[PDB]
CSV table of C-alpha atoms in Angstrom, one decimal:
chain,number,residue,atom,x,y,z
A,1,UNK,CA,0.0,0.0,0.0
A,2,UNK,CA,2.3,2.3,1.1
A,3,UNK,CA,4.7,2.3,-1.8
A,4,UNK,CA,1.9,2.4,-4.9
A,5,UNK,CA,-1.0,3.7,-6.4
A,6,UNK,CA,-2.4,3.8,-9.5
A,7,UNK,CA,-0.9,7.0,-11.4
A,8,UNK,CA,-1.1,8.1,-15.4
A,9,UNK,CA,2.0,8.8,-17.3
A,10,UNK,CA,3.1,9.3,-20.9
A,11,UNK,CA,-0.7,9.9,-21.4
A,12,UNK,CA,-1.4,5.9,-20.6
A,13,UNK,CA,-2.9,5.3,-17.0
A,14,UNK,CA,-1.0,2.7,-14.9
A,15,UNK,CA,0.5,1.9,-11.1
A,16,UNK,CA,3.2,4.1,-9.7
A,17,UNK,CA,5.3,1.9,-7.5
A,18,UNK,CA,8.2,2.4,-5.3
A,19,UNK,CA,10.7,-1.0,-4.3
A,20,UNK,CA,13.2,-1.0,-1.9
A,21,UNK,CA,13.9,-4.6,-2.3
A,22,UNK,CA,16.7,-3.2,-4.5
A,23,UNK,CA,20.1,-0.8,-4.9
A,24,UNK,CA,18.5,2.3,-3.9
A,25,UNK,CA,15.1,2.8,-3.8
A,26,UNK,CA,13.3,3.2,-7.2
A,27,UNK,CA,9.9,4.3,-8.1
A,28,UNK,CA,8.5,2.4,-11.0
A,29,UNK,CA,5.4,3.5,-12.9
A,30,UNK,CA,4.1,0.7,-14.9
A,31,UNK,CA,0.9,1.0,-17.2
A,32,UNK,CA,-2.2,-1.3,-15.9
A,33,UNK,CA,-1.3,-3.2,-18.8
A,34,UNK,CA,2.0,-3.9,-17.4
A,35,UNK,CA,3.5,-3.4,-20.5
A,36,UNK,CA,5.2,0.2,-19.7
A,37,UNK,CA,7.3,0.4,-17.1
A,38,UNK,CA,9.1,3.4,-15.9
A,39,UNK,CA,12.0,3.0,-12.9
A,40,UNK,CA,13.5,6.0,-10.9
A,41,UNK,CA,16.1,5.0,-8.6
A,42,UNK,CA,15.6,8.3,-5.6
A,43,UNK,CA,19.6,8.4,-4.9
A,44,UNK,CA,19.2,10.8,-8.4
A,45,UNK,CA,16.2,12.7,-7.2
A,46,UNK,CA,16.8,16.0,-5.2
A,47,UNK,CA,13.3,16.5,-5.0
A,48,UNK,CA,9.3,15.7,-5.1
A,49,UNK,CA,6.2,17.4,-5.3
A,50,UNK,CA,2.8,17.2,-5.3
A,51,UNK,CA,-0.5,19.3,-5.8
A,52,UNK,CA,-1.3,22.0,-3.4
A,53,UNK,CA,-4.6,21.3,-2.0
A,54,UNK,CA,-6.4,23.9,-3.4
A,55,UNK,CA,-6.1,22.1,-6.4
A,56,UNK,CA,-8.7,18.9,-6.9
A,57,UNK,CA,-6.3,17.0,-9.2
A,58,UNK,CA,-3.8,14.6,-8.0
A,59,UNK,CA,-0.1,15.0,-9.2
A,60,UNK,CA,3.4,13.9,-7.9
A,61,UNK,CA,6.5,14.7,-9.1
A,62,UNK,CA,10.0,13.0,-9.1
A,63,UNK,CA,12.7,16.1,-9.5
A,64,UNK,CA,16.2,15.0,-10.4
A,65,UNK,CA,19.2,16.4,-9.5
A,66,UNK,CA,21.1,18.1,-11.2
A,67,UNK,CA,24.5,19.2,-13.1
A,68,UNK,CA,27.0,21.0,-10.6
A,69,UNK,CA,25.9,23.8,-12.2
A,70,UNK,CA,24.7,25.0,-9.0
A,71,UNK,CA,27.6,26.9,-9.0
A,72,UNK,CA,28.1,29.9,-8.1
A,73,UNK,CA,27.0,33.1,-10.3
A,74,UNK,CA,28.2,33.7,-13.7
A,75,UNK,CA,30.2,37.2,-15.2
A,76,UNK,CA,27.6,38.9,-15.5
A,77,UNK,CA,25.5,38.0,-12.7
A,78,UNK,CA,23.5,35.7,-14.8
A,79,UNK,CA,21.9,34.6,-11.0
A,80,UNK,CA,21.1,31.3,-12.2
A,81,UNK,CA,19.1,28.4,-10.8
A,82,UNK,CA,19.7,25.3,-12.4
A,83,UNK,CA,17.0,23.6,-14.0
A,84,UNK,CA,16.0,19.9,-12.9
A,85,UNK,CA,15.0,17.1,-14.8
A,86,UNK,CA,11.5,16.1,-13.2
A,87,UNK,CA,8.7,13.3,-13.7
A,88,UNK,CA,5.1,14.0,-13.4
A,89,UNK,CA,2.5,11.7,-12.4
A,90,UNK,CA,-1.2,11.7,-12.4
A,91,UNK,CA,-3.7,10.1,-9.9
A,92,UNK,CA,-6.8,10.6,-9.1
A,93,UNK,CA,-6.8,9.5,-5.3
A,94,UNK,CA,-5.7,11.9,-2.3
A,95,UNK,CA,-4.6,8.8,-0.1
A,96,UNK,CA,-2.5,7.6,-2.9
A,97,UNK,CA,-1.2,11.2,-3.4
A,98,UNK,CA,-0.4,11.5,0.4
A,99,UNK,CA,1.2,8.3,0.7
A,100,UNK,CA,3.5,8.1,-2.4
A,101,UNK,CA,3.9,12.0,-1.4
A,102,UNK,CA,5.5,10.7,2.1
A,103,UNK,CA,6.9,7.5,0.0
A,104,UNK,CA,9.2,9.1,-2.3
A,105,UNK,CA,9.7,12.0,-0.1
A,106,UNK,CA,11.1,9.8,2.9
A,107,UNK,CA,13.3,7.7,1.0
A,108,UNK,CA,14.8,10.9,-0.5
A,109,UNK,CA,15.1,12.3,2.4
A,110,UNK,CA,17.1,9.2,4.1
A,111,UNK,CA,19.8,10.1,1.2
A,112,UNK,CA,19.7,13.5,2.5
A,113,UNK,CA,20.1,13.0,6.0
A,114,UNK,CA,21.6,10.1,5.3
A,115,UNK,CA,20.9,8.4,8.7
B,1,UNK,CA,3.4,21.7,-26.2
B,2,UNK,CA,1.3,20.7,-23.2
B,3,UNK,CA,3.7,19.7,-21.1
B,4,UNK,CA,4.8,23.7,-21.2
B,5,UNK,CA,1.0,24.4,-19.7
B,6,UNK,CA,1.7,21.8,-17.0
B,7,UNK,CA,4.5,23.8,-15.5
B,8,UNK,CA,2.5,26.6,-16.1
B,9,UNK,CA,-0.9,25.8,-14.0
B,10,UNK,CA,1.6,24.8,-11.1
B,11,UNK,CA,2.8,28.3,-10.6
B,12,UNK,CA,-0.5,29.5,-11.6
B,13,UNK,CA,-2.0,27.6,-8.5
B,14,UNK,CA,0.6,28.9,-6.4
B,15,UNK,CA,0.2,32.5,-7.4
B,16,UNK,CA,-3.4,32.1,-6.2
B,17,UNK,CA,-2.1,31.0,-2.8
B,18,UNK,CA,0.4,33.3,-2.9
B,19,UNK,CA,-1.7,36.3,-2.8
């Protein structure tokens, strides 16, 4: 329970689903059919996100870290951010969203504080 | 195309929030 859900992706409907039986933890959205199968290993996520509650719909996201290009600013100030490479996944059920919310966010987190 | 919107209505949402 507390790993999955059933979340759309790539415009196909399917199962998000995050395994720690493995190197570390993935998330894995497969399509209901089974046939698509998406795996995100969190050690290369910085972050995750979903829908503020204002919003009815039900999104996470996976954000993945990025170059080293958090560096510091450029010659001419630039100030630059630099820009992640993030998932996006649709459900349609808030204790799914909370859950794979806490989830992916936890297991991130444990490579953060690393504890 | 529409994935452009998607990042769009999440700051849009927030905007409202953020008042």
């Amino acid at each position: 329970p507390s790993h999955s859900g059933a979340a759309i992706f790539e415009k196909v409907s399917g199962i998000i689903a995050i395994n720690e039986d493995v190197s570390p933890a993935e998330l894995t959205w497969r399509s209901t059919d089974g046939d698509k199968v998406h795996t995100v290993v969190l050690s290369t996520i910085d972050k995750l996100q979903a829908t503020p509650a204002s919003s009815e719909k039900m999104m996470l996201r996976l954000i993945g870290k990025v170059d080293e290009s958090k560096k510091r600013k450029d010659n001419e100030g630039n100030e630059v951010v630099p820009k992640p490479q993030r998932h996006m996944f649709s459900f349609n059920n808030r204790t799914v969203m909370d859950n794979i919310k806490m989830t992916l966010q936890q297991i991130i987190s444990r490579y953060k504080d690393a504890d | 195309d529409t994935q452009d919107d998607f990042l769009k209505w999440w700051r849009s949402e927030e905007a409202q929030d953020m008042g």
